[PDB]
Write a protein that binds this ligand. Sequence first.
Ligand code: HEM
Ligand SMILES: [O]
Length: 293
Amino acid sequence: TPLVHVASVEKGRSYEDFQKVYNAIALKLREDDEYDNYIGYGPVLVRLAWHTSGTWDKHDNTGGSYGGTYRFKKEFNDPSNAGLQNGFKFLEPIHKEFPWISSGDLFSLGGVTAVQEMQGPKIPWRCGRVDTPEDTTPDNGRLPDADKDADYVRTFFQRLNMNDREVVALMGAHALGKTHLKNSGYEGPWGAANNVFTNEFYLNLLNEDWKLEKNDANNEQWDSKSGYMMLPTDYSLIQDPKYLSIVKEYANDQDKFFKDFSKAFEKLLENGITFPKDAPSPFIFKTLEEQGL
Ligand code: HEM
Ligand SMILES: [O]
C-alpha cells in the first residue's frame, strides 16, 4: 500500500505569487550575509532542501519533500539534521509574510533560490506539496553517514532511485559551505569559493594532495595543504572506477555539470510526488540580477 502524494496548487496561486516568494528569500540572502563567517545562508538552505527530500524511500513512497515534516519535532531533532535549524529560522519570517505556501514548497524553494542566487544553473521547480500530519514524519536514520565508502554511497542512493551520474552530480553541491565540528564532527570547507556554485568540488578532488587525518572529534577526514577537507564519502568518488570517470567529466565540463545537477536536484525535490496532467508546468524563476533588483 504505497502512498499516493498528489500535488495541489495553493488555492489560486500562479507564477507571480511564487516569484515573489523566491524574491523574498533572495533579498534576505543578500542582506543577512554575515552568517557563518560571511558564507551567508545559501549553503545551509541547499542542505535543508536535500535533507527534507532525502528521507524518501522509493519502496513505499514514505518521506520525501511532499509533507514538509521537518517542521515536526521527531524530524527537526534528527541528529543528522544538526545545524539545519539555522536555515529553518531564516525562512520563518518569509513563511509569515506568505502564509499560504506549504512547508514542503518553501523548503524546496529555498534550495532552488540559494542555488540560482549563488550563480548556479536554473532549476525548474513545481509547486503543490501539501503539509501532512505529524504521524507521517519519517523515523530518524534515513540520511547517509559520512564515514563510509563507495559501495555504501551507491547502495544508499538506490533508495532515492539515483544512478551513478545523478549521485556524482548531486555531490557537487559539496562545493558549498563547510562541515562544522559541533554539527557533524567533521571540520572545514571543501574549497575556496564557498558561496559560489561551480564545479570546484571535482577540481579539488582530482588536484589536491589529500592526507588521511583525524580531527578534534576523533573522526578521520581527508585534508589538503590548501586548507580543504573531503569526507570519506566524498573521497570515495575517486576510489571507485565508475564514479571517477564522471568526476573527471565534471572537472572538464562546467556546463555539463550544471545541466546534470539541475536535472538531478529537481528530481530529488520531486521524488514521491504525483503531478496530474492538469498541473501547471515547472516554473523557471528569474534571479534578482535578471530582475535588475
Ligand atoms: C553521501 C551523501 C552525503 C553526505 C554523507 C553528506 C554529509 C554532509 C555533512 C556531514 C555535512 C556537514 C554538516 C555540518 O557539519 O554543518 C554536509 C554539508 C553540506 N551538504 Fe552534504 N552530504 C551528502 C550529500 C549531499 C547532497 C546530495 C547535497 C545537496 C544537493 C548536499 C549538500 C550539502 C551542503 C550544501 C552542505 C554545506 C552546509 C553548510 O555549510 O551549512 N550534501 N554534508
Ligand atoms: O548533507
